[PDB]
Amino acid sequence: ASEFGVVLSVDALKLSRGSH
Amino acid sequence: SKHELSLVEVTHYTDPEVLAIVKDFHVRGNFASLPEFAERTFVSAVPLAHLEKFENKEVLFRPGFSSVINISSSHNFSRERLPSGINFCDKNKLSIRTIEKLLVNAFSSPDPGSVRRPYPSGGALYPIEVFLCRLSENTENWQAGTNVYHYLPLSQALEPVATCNTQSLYRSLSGGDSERLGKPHFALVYCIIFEKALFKYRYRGYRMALMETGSMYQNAVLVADQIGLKNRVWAGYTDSYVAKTMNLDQRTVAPLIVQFFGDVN
Amino acid sequence: SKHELSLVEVTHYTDPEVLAIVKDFHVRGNFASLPEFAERTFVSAVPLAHLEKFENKEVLFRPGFSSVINISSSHNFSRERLPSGINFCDKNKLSIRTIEKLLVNAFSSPDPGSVRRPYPSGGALYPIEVFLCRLSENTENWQAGTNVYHYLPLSQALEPVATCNTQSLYRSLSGGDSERLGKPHFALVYCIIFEKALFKYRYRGYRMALMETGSMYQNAVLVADQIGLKNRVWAGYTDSYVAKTMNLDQRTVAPLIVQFFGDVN
Amino acid sequence: MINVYSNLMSAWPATMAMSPKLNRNMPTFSQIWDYERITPASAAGETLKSIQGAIGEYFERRHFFNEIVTGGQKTLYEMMPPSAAKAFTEAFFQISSLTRDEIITHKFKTVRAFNLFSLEQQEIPAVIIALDNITAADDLKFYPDRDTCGCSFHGSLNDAIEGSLCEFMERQSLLLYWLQGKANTEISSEIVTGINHIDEILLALRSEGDIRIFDITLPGAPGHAVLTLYGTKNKISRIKYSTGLSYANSLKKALCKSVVELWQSYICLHNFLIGGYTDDDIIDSYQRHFMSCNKYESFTDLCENTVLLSDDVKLTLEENITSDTNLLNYLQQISDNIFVYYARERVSNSLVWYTKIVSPDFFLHMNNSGAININNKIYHTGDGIKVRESKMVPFP
Amino acid sequence: INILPFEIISRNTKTLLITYISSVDITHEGMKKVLESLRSKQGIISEYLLDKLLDESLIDKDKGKEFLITTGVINKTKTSPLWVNSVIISDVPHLFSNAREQWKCDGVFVSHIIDIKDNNINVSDSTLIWLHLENYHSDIVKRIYSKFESNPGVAFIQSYYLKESFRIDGVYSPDLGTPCHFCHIERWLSREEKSFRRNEMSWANLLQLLKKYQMTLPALALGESERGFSYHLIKRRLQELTGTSLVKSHVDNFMSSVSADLITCILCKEPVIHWQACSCLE
Amino acid sequence: MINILPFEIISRNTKTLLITYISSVDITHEGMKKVLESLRSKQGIISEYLLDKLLDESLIDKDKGKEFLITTGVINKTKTSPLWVNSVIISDVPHLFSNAREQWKCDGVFVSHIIDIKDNNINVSDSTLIWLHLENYHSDIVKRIYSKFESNPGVAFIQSYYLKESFRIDGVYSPDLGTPCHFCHIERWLSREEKSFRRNEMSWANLLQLLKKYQMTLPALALGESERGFSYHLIKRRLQELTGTSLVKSHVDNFMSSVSADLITCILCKEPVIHWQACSCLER
Amino acid sequence: MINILPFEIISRNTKTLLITYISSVDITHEGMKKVLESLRSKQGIISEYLLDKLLDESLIDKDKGKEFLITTGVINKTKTSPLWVNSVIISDVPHLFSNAREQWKCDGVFVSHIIDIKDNNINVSDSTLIWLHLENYHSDIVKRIYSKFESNPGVAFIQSYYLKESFRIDGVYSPDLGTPCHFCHIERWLSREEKSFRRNEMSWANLLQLLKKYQMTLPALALGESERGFSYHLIKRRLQELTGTSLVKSHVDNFMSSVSADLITCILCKEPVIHWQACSCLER
Ligand SMILES: Cc1cc2nc3c(=O)[nH]c(=O)nc-3n(C[C@H](O)[C@H](O)[C@H](O)COP(=O)(O)O)c2cc1C
Ligand SMILES: Cc1cc2nc3c(=O)[nH]c(=O)nc-3n(C[C@H](O)[C@H](O)[C@H](O)COP(=O)(O)O)c2cc1C
Ligand SMILES: Nc1ncnc2c1ncn2[C@@H]1O[C@H](COP(=O)(O)OP(=O)(O)OP(=O)(O)O)[C@@H](O)[C@H]1O
């Protein structure tokens, strides 16, 4: 949520983008 | 079992193009090495008589020139590596305690609570699996009838794999050159799990996996020398036949190298 | 120089089909790893957040089952391998005597008259070459201005290779991940000579050569631990750029793996 | 392996993979993951069967959970012949608290079906078939508890029906066993199947814990419903109980699918548990319920309370005079009111088929802890174990 | 004659025919003999052999055939190319101002470029209608379908933009009974709407809110280069659909979508199937 | 470096929607609507100062505004100095590129000049990526360019040209990085095209041809406006991958590799080529 | 096992010449001339007893005679027991093989039977290599054979058939050795033949086809007597490599691999195939 709008949809895969 | 990983998790990241191209390539290096094919096949593109000229040599960066910085041998504090054993002899009984010594020292931490192995690994992914093959009736056994085992380096435990007899397993691993090899008590077989080698780093993972195999059998070499076992790393085997005999599924996993262990009279 | 081999002898046996197919394959594993490409490239097909689930695990031959033969850790007589060093620190001067200790112990016999190396090799052909890269002005040097050398394991001597400066050589070897790496005193680069890997055993030779690379850097790991050097085997480099910087001809020879050495504060 | 990935705006699911395995004598597992559109479809056995089964289960579940549309809106006595409308009325009058007058005057959402015996075309209530909450929203007060019993997908209508019919048989058999505790026979736990992957599983389970193999086929029925049960007291085992079930004409075939399904459930849960995955990952209440049955007490409760019609334990998988008899004859003797819901779609130059076999004269679903037609032609309140009439069977 | 996929199921002396569009009680023994015969014959047959079969089973040729065509057991398809011409209907027709001229030498014959905003669009028989949209709204597809579904030998194909993707639908042919536009997208929306757990950040939310607000879905920030790329894909699919019959060409040439990732420029060719719930199946 | 990503901002009646590659938002704020229209107007990169200015103008907090614009997929922040500071296109068909400089700014690609190959006194600054694209192939054209510019500090080259029914984009040729040149590429493809059933291209027929001055043209089908259009898009996206606004990250194992496209089928093939044994590019 | 190698022994006037693959000799001895004519008459293998008998008959010392016959390339001595004790050819075109049993003895190949696929009660002994060669391909034919004979102790199979303009000889399929079967092969070739620009064959179009009963025919050009002739020679030489008189040793890395031939170009391609992921042959 933000003061600018409401989020309808998200492409989760695109939004995500030695040993750990 | 405590540190178990399911290959289902791994395959979620597999590029099938990569897997196909790597296996296509890998299989070009497989051998059909059998006693029955001796007189109609060969291994060496170089004749026996010209080989010595190629053995134990140095290729120079400036061939024909001799200007070098020499280094003292006084810095060397190591023992010379034993010669690799040939025609092994199984007259002596060999205990499970000796096989156990090799396994924990070459591949496992001394601390059974720790997950840090005595060899490094790209991404800490450890795609290479160690299988134990018992080749002599003069070799002691943990579970009668079981001649193939899988070593779990983190649990420090053996997982039964196959109840093939000892003659069949020797035949698969020893290719057409078994008579020279003689009679080892046991072998380790190092195997790549293709998707585990490939899922994170893609093609470069294949390269990292084969190198890992070498770090592993090398620890075994050094450990063998120290506990008074002879050994010989071995490439003279029919890949698919070994796989078959050990009940490995070749679509997932393949033997890269065999390593033989035992005495020498 | 006494044990010199000319690659002209080798090429007389090269199958050009084999060489082309192996290089085509090999090059699929090369990386374009540079600081300037960080924000438009990636290395891992697995997200950082899912990686831990894949690190230091065991794949089971009978997944979901726990029946095993446990093995005593009381048989382990080894030391635990040190963690692989990261952000190295070059505050201390590092002597040539220390680099020399590593070289002769990891790759050479203690007997300078002997040709028997502390790691085995398919056909005793030894296709893998060791190069030395000096990366710190706080590293002592044998011949001022020379930062790349070739180690001759049988003569036990260094052959000058390149007078690239120390900043350029660090840049090539350290890929885009140099800031995490910090400042090592030196590196070894392990390189395959393709025709030497291929001429005798054909495709299977490629497999044997990469495994050899692993036996070699492993000896270095063990030797580093013993003389109190930190190290990290390293795959985050641009293959051709390293090659270029070391003045290797990529048609003949290619870097398989880099290994970094130094202190850690 | 396989590793087919589709863009999220594709017709096709996010992923399909065949799982690598070290052991060539273990069964292949194949699975399709499609976000939370459905829960992951999977299948197990021989490699190609595994792959066909996961594809098939994916088409099946997507259809019933995500894709049904009703053919409109009718009362029970409008959509079908009278003695069937009555059978449905009596089922529904047990399942909710609404009156018979409310039930017979309510306009239900409809789906195509035909009578299993006469092939007579009719409609049945869509609320039984659709597994989403929208298709027949206005009907759910009559039938709040729906599931996938008798659901099936195939590329031949015959195969789809045969699949629906066998699952119907197995789930009717399972519920009757659950409620009464009666089985026809135990098959030797030490049976050798002759089929590599089946033997492998049995050996692994025998050495991890204990198995019991029971023929629970509806009495008098041809074919074999075979239920396999595992449990262990072993402390480092993450699976303390699992189970599998299948029905076929052939005892061997049923046993083999039974064993493979036990392993399928065993390994999925095992992987969930070692994966670290959370309860928020579980969206299906049958799965939640099965997962809360992962204790040895699930195994002993069934085993101690199982009564066997035959004395000795079956040493071989040889058929008998009953198996051979006609399944439609047997079923019709019990009830005329068995319907086949059916849908079909063109793929290339073929049709694929989605079927579900349904009877209000039988159990309409398998959750006798929800709202269920407890009184029907094969069970009546009181015949069986009473606590079990309000508890759901420990089966996923 | 193409023999479509169907099933017949028998029990007692009863028989039930199910086809892709129909479910029919078969009480005439003659027609059971005709359907059983066609069930085992795989695909394309000759008018002569069908007529021989009908005469054998004592069924009027004309009437028997009307039945088989009407219930979707057979269709009466052309051995010559299915579409003698083609037309492009678009909201960006100016992008195709030279297409008719140019594509000639590729052997692609487009008679007319047509603005979607034109009132009174006509279209000849045996014509393939290419509907290309930068501003996607499902009622635009609905409109074109309603106007032309009834034209003899008509077919349709639709291209549009979804985020980074350029999507070309399969060919929708009433005559051949291939899937339509809605068989894809309406089924896709059904699956989002009827998810076992709705992803509350689903792209269906955007699609459904654009209906509610009477707004089109725009292609995202197309420049000249993306239009050039699009143009070429269109030309090459039309080339694929040129000179094409069910004798020349397999149905999978029609029952296939092409999706192109405009960033990576990678293509994805995927099968298209019917949706039982779609109203294209009447 | 604020990179402006692909999006639209649409209004009808009182409803306003933002749609990006990442997300979609029902915008309930006039100020942010104005910000978003202004950004939709600008091509490619924007000074973080302009962004702050535009935020303050609409009375929007700067970090809240920015966090919104980044996470919703409208913009992103990049930090790294790139390898080539600049691109030039050298071509026999420069008209085809006459709006490229202008348009491709919005894709974050800086092409400084379109150069006609006919021109003498062709100049290229240091650390410039030279894109040589030929419709009418001749190897002497490539030789000339390598000859003019191989010595330039930090230079690299890409070559694109047609062969049969394919459009070819070579791997990046970088003396500094040691990567294969054009001739390494075109020999790899002329080898594959021989109906040889053999990877190995070498025979006495080839040996004899190598005695002559290296020189050649390529057979390829005639181009229409549509093949040119397709080619323009792959050029842009390839330049974008290397030097522009990254939308999709490339794996390190393929980033510099060749890209080949069938113009019939429109299928791409990305493929790393080995050094050609008879080539000189390693010895320079 | 004395194997008689290819040679001729020619006489005109008083001059007699022996010519082999190894060597040529001006024969200055009547006895050895007789020996050599007798051997040229015999097919393939000869009992070392017959050889001694033939030597003693011409008054020639036995070890001197033998050393001559071996080193000049007339014969050789082989010691090893082979993997398959016997070969059978199963075919839809058995007429094409009606002299094969007789002729191929001279190449050291023991084929015990030519079997028409039409025949019921087809029997095969243990450790027999089954060559299945089909002009009219159907996968059910292969399935039937695997089904009849996979369980036979020590069995292996080769399949040969036509695809497009190629003649295909599969790798040796050996349950014992773990090698890929026919279906592993034909899937590898049907993958390569797709204009996919991709090694990976898998997609939803393929997934859907796998739902149907595995079943297929192969498109291939019509054969003339000449294609049949060519095919007959590759069959013979392939059998010879595996079970007959070895003339040229195979490398271990290719010995069991597939052999494909273009019938237009006559070029051979020898190639090891991987196990197909969707195949069952590993699980048996
Ligand atoms: C072939 C190989 C390549 C490696 N490459 C890298 C690398 O690029 N970067 C890095 O930080 N570590 C690298 N490592 C080190 C591993 O990440 C390290 O061995 C592993 O995480 C386990 O940590 P430890 O060695 O400290 O036990 C590599 C190791 C191997 C064997
Ligand atoms: C990868 C690899 C494969 C090998 N394969 C064989 C083999 O097949 N047969 C064999 O006799 N020795 C084999 N060896 C052993 C080498 O021949 C041996 O290391 C070399 O001749 C040097 O002898 P040494 O190890 O006794 O110093 C192999 C060694 C390596 C590293
Ligand atoms: N009355 C007849 N007597 C004998 N043979 C006939 C007769 N009618 C048709 N045939 C044969 O059957 C074949 C099939 O022709 P048919 O009339 O079915 O046209 P079609 O197959 O529908 O082709 P199209 O409509 O595409 O031209 C003909 O080529 C002809 O040899």
Ligand SMILES: Nc1ncnc2c1ncn2[C@@H]1O[C@H](COP(=O)(O)OP(=O)(O)O)[C@@H](O)[C@H]1O
């Ligand atoms: N060859 C096939 N073609 C289409 N669908 C299939 C095929 N084989 C199995 N299925 C379907 O896959 C689903 C899963 O089958 P399976 O795993 O055997 O049994 P279960 O019903 O226990 O899941 C069922 O809908 C089944 O009908």
Ligand SMILES: [Cl-]
């Ligand atoms: Cl059955």
Ligand SMILES: [Mg+2]
């Ligand atoms: Mg299932």
Ligand SMILES: [Mg+2]
């Ligand atoms: Mg089911």
Ligand SMILES: [Mg+2]
């Ligand atoms: Mg089931």
Ligand SMILES: [Zn+2]
């Ligand atoms: Zn439709």
Ligand SMILES: [Zn+2]
């Ligand atoms: Zn070059």
Ligand SMILES: [Zn+2]
């Ligand atoms: Zn196979």
